[PDB]
Amino acid sequence: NLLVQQVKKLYKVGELLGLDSETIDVLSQPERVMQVKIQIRSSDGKLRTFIGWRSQHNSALGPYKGGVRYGPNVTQDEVIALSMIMTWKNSLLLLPYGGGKGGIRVDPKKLTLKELEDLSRKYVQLIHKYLGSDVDIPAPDINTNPQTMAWFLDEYIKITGKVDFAVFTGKPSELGGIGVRLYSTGLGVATIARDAANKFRVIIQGFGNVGFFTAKFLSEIIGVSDIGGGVINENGIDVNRALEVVEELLISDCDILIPAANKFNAPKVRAKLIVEGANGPLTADADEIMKQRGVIVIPDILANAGGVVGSYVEWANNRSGGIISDEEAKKLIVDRMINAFNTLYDFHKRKFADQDLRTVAMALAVDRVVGAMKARGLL
Amino acid sequence: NLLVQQVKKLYKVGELLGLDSETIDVLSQPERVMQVKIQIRSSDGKLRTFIGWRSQHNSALGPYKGGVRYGPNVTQDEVIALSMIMTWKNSLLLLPYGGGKGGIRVDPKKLTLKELEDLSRKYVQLIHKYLGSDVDIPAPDINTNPQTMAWFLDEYIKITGKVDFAVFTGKPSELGGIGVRLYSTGLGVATIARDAANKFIGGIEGSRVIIQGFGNVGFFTAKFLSEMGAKIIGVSDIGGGVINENGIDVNRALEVVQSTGSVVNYLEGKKVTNEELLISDCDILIPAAVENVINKFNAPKVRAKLIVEGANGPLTADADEIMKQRGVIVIPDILANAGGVVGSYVEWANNRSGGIISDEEAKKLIVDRMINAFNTLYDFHKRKFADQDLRTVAMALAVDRVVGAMKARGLL
Amino acid sequence: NLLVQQVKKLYKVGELLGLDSETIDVLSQPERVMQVKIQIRSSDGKLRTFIGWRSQHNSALGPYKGGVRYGPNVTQDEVIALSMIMTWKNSLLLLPYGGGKGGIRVDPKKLTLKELEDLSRKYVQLIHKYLGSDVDIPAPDINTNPQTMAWFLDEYIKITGKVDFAVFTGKPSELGGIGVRLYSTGLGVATIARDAANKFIGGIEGSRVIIQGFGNVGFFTAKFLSEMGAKIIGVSDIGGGVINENGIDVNRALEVVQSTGSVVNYLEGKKVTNEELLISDCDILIPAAVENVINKFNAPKVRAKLIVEGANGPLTADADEIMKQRGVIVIPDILANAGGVVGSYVEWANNRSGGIISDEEAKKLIVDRMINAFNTLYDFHKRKFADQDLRTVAMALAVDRVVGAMKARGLL
Amino acid sequence: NLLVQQVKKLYKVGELLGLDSETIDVLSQPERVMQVKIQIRSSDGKLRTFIGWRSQHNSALGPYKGGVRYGPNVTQDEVIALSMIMTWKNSLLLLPYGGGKGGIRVDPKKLTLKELEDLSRKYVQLIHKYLGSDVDIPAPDINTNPQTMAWFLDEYIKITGKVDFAVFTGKPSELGGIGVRLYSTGLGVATIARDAANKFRVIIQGFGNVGFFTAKFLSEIIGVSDIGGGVINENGIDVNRALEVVEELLISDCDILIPAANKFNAPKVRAKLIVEGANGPLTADADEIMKQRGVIVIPDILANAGGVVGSYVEWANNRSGGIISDEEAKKLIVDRMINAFNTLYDFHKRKFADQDLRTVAMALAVDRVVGAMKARGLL
Ligand SMILES: NC(=O)c1ccc[n+]([C@@H]2O[C@H](COP(=O)([O-])OP(=O)(O)OC[C@H]3O[C@@H](n4cnc5c(N)ncnc54)[C@H](O)[C@@H]3O)[C@@H](O)[C@H]2O)c1
Ligand SMILES: NC(=O)c1ccc[n+]([C@@H]2O[C@H](COP(=O)([O-])OP(=O)(O)OC[C@H]3O[C@@H](n4cnc5c(N)ncnc54)[C@H](O)[C@@H]3O)[C@@H](O)[C@H]2O)c1
Ligand SMILES: CCCC(=O)C(=O)O
Ligand SMILES: CCCC(=O)C(=O)O
């Protein structure tokens, strides 16, 4: 389902780049995927086994990088498909990294912390021979957190005997992690929103992980909204003390609208600059409508990826010995988010002027990968 | 669907054994499965990519063991199912080996010899971190041969720098291999089939034998069984088969394959389809080709007194019941085709020991394990489980050892 | 014969330093040399085998470092000699790197691109146990390029399973490389040549420059030196050269190579032989091709005030003396072409650090080391050793660090 | 010098087997060769550096196997050439092994035991990354002994941290070595001499390492000789108490003559069966003369190689855990010396009947190697 859309999106992009179907077959299918059986024992002695996956999609540009999600609906193909988005995303942001992802078919709610810990450990253990700081670097995803990374990390240290901080990302700050991890996506969305209005009055549909920091860094904001709504105060709201208190907003009248959380309500937004703060804030129709309407949409794969850049800098930090200051890490995100958007402005002019920035982004993502593979003699 | 079948057979025996469905769940699933993408550049510059799998089913009793098949219809699920049967085969014969198997989705016929080498090398290279003399020892299966094993071998020595002969089995005798291994599976099937006939249907001499498949298993099965005084009245391959109730010259039959492509083109006999062969009149039927070839629909029509399973997983679970209902004796593959794995256990053992087992010591090592495992099965059937088919008894033994070993290691 | 020359130059400086001939014997010899046999299958099935070397000269100051050249005349002895100069170059510039170099006896022109890849991969594969990010980091030399480094890279990731970018330097910028590295050697030679001209012959502007060689070093040397206001009045390659006292358009010159094969075919100028070029009238002569190109016989005829050595080992030891006798200043290669190794030190350093050095930080990192090493050499010449040529002073520094480090490690 | 004769002998044999010159180029040149600088410090503080080599000729059939010689005249090319003889010899005796050899340019006489020890250690150390029980297995040669192997062994244990007995051969019996090492060549020469007279009154020019044991096992001997001569007692001399006492013999009248230590004295030997106990007991002329004269000559490469077979069994023993009894090791030499000679009798009939047994032996040696390489896709 996610797979089939990702393969489709890919073949669409391959024809546009002028690629053999055989060359796109390569790009499509993952290099390696492993599946592992995890037996977990409950307090009562009850035995349950759980199946999990690591899809290592592509490593043209570097070692596989990407998080691990726990969930009762995860499937081999969801993991693979998520592999692929990571390949393209890392490519676009010019990271020394390829695409990987992992998942386990489990409902974490139905497990104690002791069982999760045991589950997290055994997954790592069953796949470690294709993990490493220089081969495959997992991270948090859905139902996975810095705590999951500490269990991953400790179990790795148990097997290899090395305190290799950089093998996992999203780690707690006291175990090789870095501070910006929380304001990464935000700093990301913010620095993209700013230099995008420069080339081409803010609203933010959200104030959680991303929205709040997107709001703070940009003001350094006429709208705000929660799962319970917000206020279109034209003053510009106080971004701090909105935290002390914890359809209209989209259609509202602004210069930048930042979804941080359809064809119907698409031709009504008055924002002439979209900075997609989460994944999939628009539909396949609502780009048609935004493109026709001449309103610039900066997509998921770039605007929301201050997080994976944050994990890169965490990775970089570990290898440098943890010397990178928070000041210097901040600047590395902005450098890596500016550089990547200016290559997507410069590719956008010299060719594919006709085309949407999502399609052009992932084009450039594939172009960079195929280019690396050609140079290594892999096609 | 091999998976589905093999899982049903495991539950059948699990419930008999008194195992929780949670335990059987653990046994059922492979510990680790890898799929890998293999890209091949034709001589004209056409790029073809192919998918392969290595299924590492169970490692309670030792490192994973088993063959790799190349074929257009191989699938993740069947290689996992072939994994399963390795586990039981290795357990039944008391080998320090778990169960594993590999497969690639490819039609070797549509590739050149240079393409298959490249293919073979990249397969190994893409999984080699979960291979080893003490991790996972592959071997030949369908459309794989000692040459395949030499490309595998050679590629592993390049990657690691070590001439560890024991990482692959079924190797040419000049590269750490052992001559018996070429024909150990067929010799095993022949040996078991004769013991079975002596104990059940009045012996092997004069006996009318149909063999489906005429490759490394089927040919050698037929050769040895013919040397032993059996009458081989039917033979077949992918191309179809031939029944001659006056017997078939096996060597000449092979020549007809070599000069023709298939064994339907045997001149002295009646051409039959594979389905027709399976239900043709015979004393002993030996499926020595592919799985699930006898099912709920043709099993009522099978005419043999005794089925000896050369191939991995020839009958469905429903076929197993019917054979039981009809009083038709089936020698499990877990025991009948073990001459392969036993032969490669000795190949392996000889490698670690440094090459100091002669070809006759080896031959004896293989035949003896084979018979002893038969006599164990036979005796254990008479004493306990005398109302169950043989595969059930074999499986009981095989599954019990594995669970025992998992218990001790604290895995269960 | 590069070996012979480089050994003489080392004894010259050793005796000056007051080292026992036993010590110089140790310094002289490479710690380890590998030769390997590489077999290549042409598209028609013709088998060609080629010999390559990796010379690991000295590792006192760190892991071995240096390029690989492909060429029909490369020899064990020259790669060992090129090793030596790496040691001194790495020591003079305070890099945590010993000296190494590689070579293959092959004419790349007579191979296809598919043959050179195979060639490049098997070279690495046959020595890879004595390579590593912390053992021996190769890089481009003559007839080797970022593409070569990518085949090397890719083959190493296959063998080991690890994407350690830092195992090779001069890599394409999209595979762990750094853009400055493409032109760091030429930028270094240009930078040093300008500083040298400002301090000795009244500056670089208007200055008449002959460059022998027009590849990765010579072209970029000429480009930057031309950007800096020098007049490049002669250029050459294997095909011969051209002198135009009105200056040569460097970019257009490169185009004449690209569309023609050689730079003799430059339209606006006088065609000369390489020998004629070397002794042609100029302010600054920059050998940026091969070794031993100036010797006892043409050194008396060299017309330049200042020789800047782009290439490794351009003058013989006898040429060095003559240049001294005649008062002709020679900037050692150990310092002039270091922009390469400095550029790849930063490429390497950036890899281990995770890719977080920008291309401008890198550029500055390289230029600064280059100048500082010049100023050190210059100042150290004025204070001690003011009666010795510059190469002697540089060598004094370089050799002394190495012996110091060997002492502390108890190797000497 | 040794090189050029070995390359020549090889190209002679390649044409006879019907091989491309490009295929013989491969076979000729070694796969890898390394050279290492060894600095040794004397008691007086004097520093001396010594250059040494490991030539790893071919590994078609298995890991490189072959000894290390010390000597002031050893050269890279002597080592390479010695590589090659080992490749062919191992092939002929059907060993799971290829050809390697090593040497150091040193006069051991001019070094103390402390300096030799240090020299022996550092050689191993400088090459260990291409040594191992499964990659390259050195042994004793000239000016090298079981004591040299103990220093090799200990230094290896120091680097790797593993007591891998099988990495070196010729070890003292109390450090992974085996008993037959002394009567190996003898048992070799003896069992070859016996089953050769069967197919087709003994003399032995020598009674040292090989001669004595060749004499004992065969009697279980009308001639004997030393560097100081012997006695042609027609009784058959007492082989034991000849040890208690420590041109004519060759020309003498016997059925088997066994040189254990030229055209001129070649047409006079009355022996109709030569079992070459040392290397090069005949000349390139004296085979012409022996062949013409119809007198069967069993060459160096097979008859004297009970030693390398002995080291194989030592190797085999180490890997099996040192369980092989002296009884069982004895039988393994004879099995490996019979098998190898019966393949050289069976190849000799089916083809190359016209040809000498030296040329036919090394033919079969090359045929087996090229065959293995073909199967591995190496030519
Ligand atoms: N001895 C071994 O190396 C070995 C090892 C492992 C497993 N096995 C098992 O034994 C069986 C035989 O394999 P093999 O090694 O002889 O293979 P093979 O490739 O040597 O020969 C296969 C034979 O089966 C025939 N065949 C293929 N598809 C067929 C079909 N659909 N219907 C009928 N015949 C068909 C082929 O034409 C050929 O005659 C397989 O089930 C295999 O899993 C054998
Ligand atoms: N920047 C680098 O990558 C690098 C690295 C290490 C060493 N170097 C040294 O710098 C020098 C230049 O090498 P490069 O990288 O520019 O090589 P290159 O292969 O890029 O170019 C070689 C150039 O020299 C010319 N040449 C070749 N043989 C010649 C001859 N006999 N006479 C005159 N010209 C000849 C070629 O035609 C070409 O113009 C060499 O001595 C090399 O050892 C350069
Ligand atoms: C040696 C493995 C044989 C095999 O895979 C089989 O018998 O199925
Ligand atoms: C980075 C190595 C460069 C080199 O080999 C040289 O400058 O000679």
PDB file of C-alpha atoms in Angstrom, chain C residues 22 25-26 29-37 39 41 46-47 49 51 57-58 76 80 125-130 406 411-412, chain D residues 22-23 25-26 29-37 39 41 46-47 49 51 57 76 80 125-130 373 378-379:
ATOM      1  CA  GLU C  22      73.130   2.150   9.774  1.00  0.00           C
ATOM      2  CA  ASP C  25      70.042   2.236   5.921  1.00  0.00           C
ATOM      3  CA  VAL C  26      66.896   1.861   8.038  1.00  0.00           C
ATOM      4  CA  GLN C  29      64.439   0.870   3.020  1.00  0.00           C
ATOM      5  CA  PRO C  30      60.636   0.462   2.881  1.00  0.00           C
ATOM      6  CA  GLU C  31      59.113  -1.338   5.871  1.00  0.00           C
ATOM      7  CA  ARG C  32      56.942  -3.420   3.549  1.00  0.00           C
ATOM      8  CA  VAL C  33      56.479  -3.929  -0.167  1.00  0.00           C
ATOM      9  CA  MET C  34      53.823  -6.053  -1.836  1.00  0.00           C
ATOM     10  CA  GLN C  35      53.799  -7.125  -5.468  1.00  0.00           C
ATOM     11  CA  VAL C  36      50.583  -8.762  -6.781  1.00  0.00           C
ATOM     12  CA  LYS C  37      49.549 -10.476 -10.025  1.00  0.00           C
ATOM     13  CA  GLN C  39      44.685 -11.148 -14.425  1.00  0.00           C
ATOM     14  CA  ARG C  41      39.915 -10.981 -19.347  1.00  0.00           C
ATOM     15  CA  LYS C  46      42.147 -12.813 -24.278  1.00  0.00           C
ATOM     16  CA  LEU C  47      43.794 -13.120 -20.848  1.00  0.00           C
ATOM     17  CA  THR C  49      48.139 -10.436 -16.547  1.00  0.00           C
ATOM     18  CA  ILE C  51      51.962  -6.700 -12.043  1.00  0.00           C
ATOM     19  CA  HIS C  57      57.978   2.898   3.128  1.00  0.00           C
ATOM     20  CA  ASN C  58      57.750   4.254   6.635  1.00  0.00           C
ATOM     21  CA  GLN C  76      58.926  -1.908  -8.158  1.00  0.00           C
ATOM     22  CA  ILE C  80      59.412   2.358  -3.643  1.00  0.00           C
ATOM     23  CA  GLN C 125      41.522  -6.738  -3.358  1.00  0.00           C
ATOM     24  CA  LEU C 126      45.002  -8.345  -3.538  1.00  0.00           C
ATOM     25  CA  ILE C 127      46.534  -5.979  -0.918  1.00  0.00           C
ATOM     26  CA  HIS C 128      43.458  -5.019   1.146  1.00  0.00           C
ATOM     27  CA  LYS C 129      44.701  -6.700   4.319  1.00  0.00           C
ATOM     28  CA  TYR C 130      47.502  -4.126   4.463  1.00  0.00           C
ATOM     29  CA  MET C 406      61.268   6.299  15.548  1.00  0.00           C
ATOM     30  CA  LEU C 411      62.580   1.604  16.552  1.00  0.00           C
ATOM     31  CA  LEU C 412      65.984   3.289  16.271  1.00  0.00           C
TER      32      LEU C 412
ATOM     33  CA  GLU D  22      48.836 -16.275 -21.342  1.00  0.00           C
ATOM     34  CA  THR D  23      47.632 -19.168 -19.182  1.00  0.00           C
ATOM     35  CA  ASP D  25      52.056 -16.389 -17.626  1.00  0.00           C
ATOM     36  CA  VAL D  26      49.387 -16.586 -14.955  1.00  0.00           C
ATOM     37  CA  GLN D  29      53.968 -15.160 -11.813  1.00  0.00           C
ATOM     38  CA  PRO D  30      53.209 -15.372  -8.056  1.00  0.00           C
ATOM     39  CA  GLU D  31      49.879 -14.174  -6.688  1.00  0.00           C
ATOM     40  CA  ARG D  32      51.516 -12.104  -4.001  1.00  0.00           C
ATOM     41  CA  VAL D  33      55.044 -11.455  -2.758  1.00  0.00           C
ATOM     42  CA  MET D  34      56.024  -9.307   0.192  1.00  0.00           C
ATOM     43  CA  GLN D  35      59.356  -7.926   1.298  1.00  0.00           C
ATOM     44  CA  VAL D  36      60.025  -6.620   4.806  1.00  0.00           C
ATOM     45  CA  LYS D  37      62.791  -4.630   6.506  1.00  0.00           C
ATOM     46  CA  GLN D  39      66.137  -3.983  12.089  1.00  0.00           C
ATOM     47  CA  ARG D  41      70.149  -4.640  17.431  1.00  0.00           C
ATOM     48  CA  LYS D  46      75.242  -2.128  16.651  1.00  0.00           C
ATOM     49  CA  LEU D  47      72.252  -1.822  14.309  1.00  0.00           C
ATOM     50  CA  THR D  49      68.885  -4.242   8.957  1.00  0.00           C
ATOM     51  CA  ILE D  51      65.671  -7.837   4.007  1.00  0.00           C
ATOM     52  CA  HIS D  57      52.897 -18.320  -5.570  1.00  0.00           C
ATOM     53  CA  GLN D  76      63.609 -12.261  -3.905  1.00  0.00           C
ATOM     54  CA  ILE D  80      59.741 -16.881  -5.739  1.00  0.00           C
ATOM     55  CA  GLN D 125      55.173  -9.850  12.638  1.00  0.00           C
ATOM     56  CA  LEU D 126      55.762  -7.843   9.464  1.00  0.00           C
ATOM     57  CA  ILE D 127      53.821 -10.360   7.298  1.00  0.00           C
ATOM     58  CA  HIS D 128      51.215 -11.919   9.665  1.00  0.00           C
ATOM     59  CA  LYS D 129      48.230 -10.280   7.995  1.00  0.00           C
ATOM     60  CA  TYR D 130      48.851 -12.781   5.140  1.00  0.00           C
ATOM     61  CA  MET D 373      41.604 -22.418 -11.311  1.00  0.00           C
ATOM     62  CA  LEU D 378      40.456 -17.724 -12.418  1.00  0.00           C
ATOM     63  CA  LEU D 379      41.290 -18.528 -16.003  1.00  0.00           C
TER      64      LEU D 379
END
